Design an enzyme around this catalytic site. Sequence first.
Site, PDB file in Angstrom:
ATOM      1  N   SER A 109     -46.222  17.751  -2.410  1.00  0.00           N
ATOM      2  CA  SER A 109     -44.837  17.736  -1.945  1.00  0.00           C
ATOM      3  C   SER A 109     -44.260  19.138  -1.830  1.00  0.00           C
ATOM      4  O   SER A 109     -44.501  19.757  -0.782  1.00  0.00           O
ATOM      5  CB  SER A 109     -43.988  16.836  -2.845  1.00  0.00           C
ATOM      6  OG  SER A 109     -43.818  17.348  -4.147  1.00  0.00           O
ATOM      7  N   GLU A 112     -44.387   6.819   0.989  1.00  0.00           N
ATOM      8  CA  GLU A 112     -43.734   8.060   0.576  1.00  0.00           C
ATOM      9  C   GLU A 112     -42.275   7.884   0.201  1.00  0.00           C
ATOM     10  O   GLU A 112     -41.832   8.549  -0.737  1.00  0.00           O
ATOM     11  CB  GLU A 112     -43.879   9.097   1.700  1.00  0.00           C
ATOM     12  CG  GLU A 112     -45.334   9.488   1.918  1.00  0.00           C
ATOM     13  CD  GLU A 112     -45.884  10.385   0.828  1.00  0.00           C
ATOM     14  OE1 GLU A 112     -45.172  10.638  -0.165  1.00  0.00           O
ATOM     15  OE2 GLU A 112     -47.039  10.839   0.974  1.00  0.00           O
ATOM     16  N   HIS A 118     -45.145   8.230  -3.839  1.00  0.00           N
ATOM     17  CA  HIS A 118     -45.161   9.679  -3.726  1.00  0.00           C
ATOM     18  C   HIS A 118     -45.601  10.255  -5.060  1.00  0.00           C
ATOM     19  O   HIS A 118     -45.098   9.848  -6.107  1.00  0.00           O
ATOM     20  CB  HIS A 118     -43.770  10.116  -3.326  1.00  0.00           C
ATOM     21  CG  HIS A 118     -43.509  11.548  -3.045  1.00  0.00           C
ATOM     22  ND1 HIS A 118     -43.965  12.188  -1.921  1.00  0.00           N
ATOM     23  CD2 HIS A 118     -42.802  12.473  -3.743  1.00  0.00           C
ATOM     24  CE1 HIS A 118     -43.572  13.451  -1.938  1.00  0.00           C
ATOM     25  NE2 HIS A 118     -42.860  13.647  -3.036  1.00  0.00           N
TER      26      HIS A 118
HETATM   27  C1  LIG Z   1     -42.275  11.667  -7.244  1.00  0.00           C
HETATM   28  C2  LIG Z   1     -42.473  12.637  -8.462  1.00  0.00           C
HETATM   29  N1  LIG Z   1     -42.637  14.149  -8.177  1.00  0.00           N
HETATM   30  C3  LIG Z   1     -42.529  14.985  -9.481  1.00  0.00           C
HETATM   31  C4  LIG Z   1     -44.031  14.412  -7.564  1.00  0.00           C
HETATM   32  C5  LIG Z   1     -41.518  14.575  -7.293  1.00  0.00           C
HETATM   33  C6  LIG Z   1     -40.212  14.766  -7.706  1.00  0.00           C
HETATM   34  C7  LIG Z   1     -39.210  15.178  -6.819  1.00  0.00           C
HETATM   35  C8  LIG Z   1     -39.500  15.399  -5.482  1.00  0.00           C
HETATM   36  C9  LIG Z   1     -40.802  15.215  -5.041  1.00  0.00           C
HETATM   37  O1  LIG Z   1     -41.088  15.433  -3.724  1.00  0.00           O
HETATM   38  C10 LIG Z   1     -41.777  14.802  -5.946  1.00  0.00           C
END
Ligand SMILES: CC[N+](C)(C)c1cccc(O)c1
Lengths: 527, 527
Positions: free
Chosen positions: B197, B324, B437
Site C-alpha cells: 500500500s 481492496e 487489504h
Molecule cells: C489494512 C491495514 N494496513 C496497516 C496494511 C493499512 C492501514 C492503513 C492504510 C493502508 O493502505 C493499509
Amino acid sequence: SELLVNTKSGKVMGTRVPVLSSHISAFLGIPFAEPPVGNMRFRRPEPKKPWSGVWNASTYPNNCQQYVDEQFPGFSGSEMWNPNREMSEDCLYLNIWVPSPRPKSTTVMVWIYGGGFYSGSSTLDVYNGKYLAYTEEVVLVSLSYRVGAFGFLALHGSQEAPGNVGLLDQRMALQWVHDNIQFFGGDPKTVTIFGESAGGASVGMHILSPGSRDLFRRAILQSGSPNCPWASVSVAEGRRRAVELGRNLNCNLNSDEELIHCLREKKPQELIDVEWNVLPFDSIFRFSFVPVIDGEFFPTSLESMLNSGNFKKTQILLGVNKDEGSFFLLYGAPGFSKDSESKISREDFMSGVKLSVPHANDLGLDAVTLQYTDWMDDNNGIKNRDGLDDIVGDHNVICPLMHFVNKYTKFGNGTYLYFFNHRASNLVWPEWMGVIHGYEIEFVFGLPLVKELNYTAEEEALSRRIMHYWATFAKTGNPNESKWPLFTTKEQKFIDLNTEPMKVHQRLRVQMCVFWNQFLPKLLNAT
Amino acid sequence: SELLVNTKSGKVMGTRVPVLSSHISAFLGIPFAEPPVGNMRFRRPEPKKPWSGVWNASTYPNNCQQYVDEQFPGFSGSEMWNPNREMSEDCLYLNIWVPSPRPKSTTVMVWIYGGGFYSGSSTLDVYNGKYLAYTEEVVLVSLSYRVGAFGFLALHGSQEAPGNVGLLDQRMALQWVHDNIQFFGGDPKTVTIFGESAGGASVGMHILSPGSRDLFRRAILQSGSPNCPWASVSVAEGRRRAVELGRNLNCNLNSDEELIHCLREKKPQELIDVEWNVLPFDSIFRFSFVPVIDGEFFPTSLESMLNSGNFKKTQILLGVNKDEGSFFLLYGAPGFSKDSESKISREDFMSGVKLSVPHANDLGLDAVTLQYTDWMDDNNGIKNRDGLDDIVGDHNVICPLMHFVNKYTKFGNGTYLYFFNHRASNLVWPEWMGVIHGYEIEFVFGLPLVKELNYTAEEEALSRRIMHYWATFAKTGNPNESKWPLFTTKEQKFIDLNTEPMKVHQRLRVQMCVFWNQFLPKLLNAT
Ligand SMILES: CC[N+](C)(C)c1cccc(O)c1
Ligand SMILES: CC[N+](C)(C)c1cccc(O)c1
C-alpha cells in the site's frame, strides 16, 4: 345484400373475399377525404364530399407517393414493404374487412402502418386483415396517410403547409370510422387503433393529442412510441428541413408562399428524389419529414404531456422486438451485408455508434461505447455486430418505449407489455439480423395460418395466440380471457411472445435504458 | 562471531533468533540517520554520524509517532497494525535478518511498510522477516520512515519543511543498505525493495525519482502504486494542508518560519490529535500528509514521467488483493459494522459512492453509480455492499495499479502480475470484508509456517509458494525457477495467488478500469 352498405358519405358496394375455408366481406378503397392533389398538396385533409350511386369498394386503392426501396431488387424480404399498387397523391382511402354474416355491433380494430413516416401502404400483403377479421370476428379497418414531404412538410405558421397533415389524415379516417363503422356492424365505442413503428408512434400521438383522444377506445403500440428519437422534430427543424428541400429543387426561398408554390408545382418524384438530402446529420434511424411539435396537434412538449398526465387515460398494449436495430444497420452502417455474417471491426463499430447517436458529442459517444463494449474481447466481430444492433434498438425503439410505458402507466388504466423474440422459420433475411423490426406484423395478421406460406405448426399457434391477445384486448382492455401480467411501475412485469410456453419477466432492459433515458441525456446536457 | 559485524558506520552486536527448528542472526534497531528530533523535525534526514564501540542490535527500536487505531480495542485484527513499541521521533532505524551461517554474498530484500503514510512500524509481528530470511536464505532488511505530519508536512519552498522527508528517510536507509549490506553477507547489487500500500506506492516512487533508482535492483509492489489517488498531493494542497494543521494548533500563520517554529514546539501527539481535520473533503481512502509532487524528488508530474519512460527500467513484480475496499468502508462508510453482515441500502450506498470519489461532481457520481449498480436488483443489500467494496478498491488500488503496469511495461524489463484472492482460514475479520487489504503480507512473510498460528496445510504451501516467488524473483528478476506468465501489454497475462492450483487470466478488471482510467477522468474534465 351483405356487400351493399349505406354510410353517411354514400352507398358502398363491397366484395366477398375468401379466407381459409370460408368467406368475409371486404370494403376496400373507401374515400375518407378529398384527394390532396393540386394546391391542396401539403394542406390539411378535407372531408370526402358525399357521393351518389354505389361506390365500388372491390379493389385496393392507390398508395401514397413515397420512396421505394430498391436496395435489394427482387428480394422479397424488402419488396414486401414496397408499394404493391400504383402510387398517387390521390391516396387517402381506407379498407374494412367484415365477418360473414355481418356482425350487429362487434369490436373494431384500426391499423396504422409504419414506415418511419416516409413510406407505408395499407395494401401490403402482410397487412391483409382478412385473417384477423375472420378468426377473431372483428371489424378490421386499415387506413392510409400521406407520408414523406407530402404528409409532413412543416412550414409552421403557414396554413398551406402547417405540418402534421399526415397525422390529420389518420384522424379523419378515425372520424370516418367513428361516424360510419356502425353500418358495417362495428361498434364505434370499442375501436382500437394499433400500428407498428411509425404507426405505433402515431397511435401514442393520438393518445396525446387532445383532438384525437375521443375518437378511439384502446390502443396497441408495436415497436414505436410518440417520444421515439426519430418520431418528431421542432417547428424550427421542420422549417429548416422544409427550406432545404426547397433549396434542393431550386425554389424561390424568399417566402413560405414562394417556397410552397414551388414545391406544389414540382412532381411527386421530384420531392422524393431529394428527400434524404435535408437530414441534419450523417445518421441511421432518422427520417426527413416527421410530425412536428407545433403547439396545435401537440399542446406542448411530449415529455411534459407525459409528465403531467396530459393524455387520454385508457388501456394500452405495447411491445418491442428483440433485434430492433439490425434492419437500419444493414442499410446504412458500414461492414454490414445482407449476404455476409456481418462481423464488425472496432473501426466500423465506432462508425456505427456515430451514426446511431448523431446528436451525441465526443463524451456521449464515449459513454455509449464504454457501455456497449466488452473490453475483455473488444475485437470480437460478433460481439461488435450485436453491440451495434442493441445500440440502434435500445436508443431508437426499446428505451424510448420503456419511458413512455413507465410514464403512461402512472396515470393510465392498464398496461400490457410484450417482448417478441421469435424468428419466423421462413425468414428470408440473414440470421444475424435476428428478430427483425416489423416481423411481428405477419404474426399479428395471422399469416402463419396460410400453409402455402410454409410456417411451422407452432408458429401457427403463436399467430393465433397473438391474434387472440390482440383481439381480446381490444374488446375488453385485457389480453387475457397463462395470464399475461399487467404492467405496473413497481413490479414492471412483461412477457415473451414466442413459440415456447410464455414466461413472465421484469424490468425490460433496465440497465441499458437507465443509461439511455437518464444518464446520457444528463451527460450531453452537462457537457 | 557471527553476531559481530563491522560497518562503515560502526561495530554492530546482533542477536541470535530462533526460527522454526533452527536459528538466524538478527541485527535490529541499527541507526541509519540522525534522530529527527528538535529543530530537525520536518527536516530532511541526516546521516548517522559513525559511532565507537559495539552498537547493541538485539532489540527492536522505537516506532515513529503516529495515529494509533483505537477503533476496536483489543481486537487483534486491527491492533496487529498498531505500534507494538514505544513511539518516538527518534525512530529512524532499520532491521536485518541474516541466515546462519552468514552468507558471503546473497540477495537482499528491503521491506517498506504501508499505512496510508500516516502509520506503520517495522516491528509489527506480521513484518517479522525471520521466516523469509531462513526459508529463502535472503538478507531481509526492514526500514522505517517518518509518517504523518512528521514525515510529510510540506511547506514547499521552505528548507525547514520541504516535504517528502519521509521519502528521503527511506532513501537514506537504501543508501545505508547499499553501503553496508556486504558486511552482513548481502549483495548490494541485488537488492530488491518491496512494500505494501503506502510502501508499495513508495517503491514505485523510488523507481520514479532519479535520486533513488541507482540504489536498488528490482522492485515488488503490493496493493499500491505511485499514481494511487491518495499517494500524493500538489505542493499547493500540501501547503494548504500544512497551514490548516497550523490553524488547528493556534499557530502564527504569517510565515512558513512562524508556522514551522510553532509546529516544532508542539508535542507529537498534538499534531496527531488534529491530523485528520485538514483533509479537504468528506472522504474515505484519503490521508492527510503524503508525498508532494515537488519537482525535486519528482522531476515532474507522475503521468508524464510514466508517459515518457522517465523512470528506472528493470523487473517489477506487483499485484492486488480481491477486496481492496472493505477495510476503508468498515471504518468510515455508513451502514458497515464489524459485527454485522453489512447489507447496504441505496441511501447508504449512494453515501458510500460520495465518500469514495470526493473529487467527483454530480455527473461523475452518477456515472459511477450507473456502472456499479445492478438496476435489475438495485435494492439488494449484498449487491450494494459488494458494489461499494469494488468501487473503493478499483478506484484507489486496482485501477491506479493497472495504469502503472500498462505504462511501466511499455519501457520496463519484465512485469509479473498477481491477483491474491485467498481468505486466510484464521481471519478474525467479518467474512463480508473478504480478501482484505494487507492480508497478503502474512503470506509473504511466511507466517503460515508457524503452526501455533493455526493456518491450514494448504495455506502453509501457499506461503512457501509466495515466499519462493518473492525471493526467486528478487534474486533473478523472474519468479519462476506452473509458470507465472510475464505481463505484456498485448496479452495482459496475470495469475491467481490462492490455495488452488494457480490459473492464468488476462486483462485484470478491464471493464471497470477503462471507466476509472479513461472515461471518468474525461467526463469530469469535460464537465
Ligand atoms: C489494512 C491495514 N494496513 C496497516 C496494511 C493499512 C492501514 C492503513 C492504510 C493502508 O493502505 C493499509
Ligand atoms: C422494417 C420494415 N418496415 C416497413 C416495418 C419499416 C420501414 C422503415 C422504417 C421502419 O421503422 C419500419
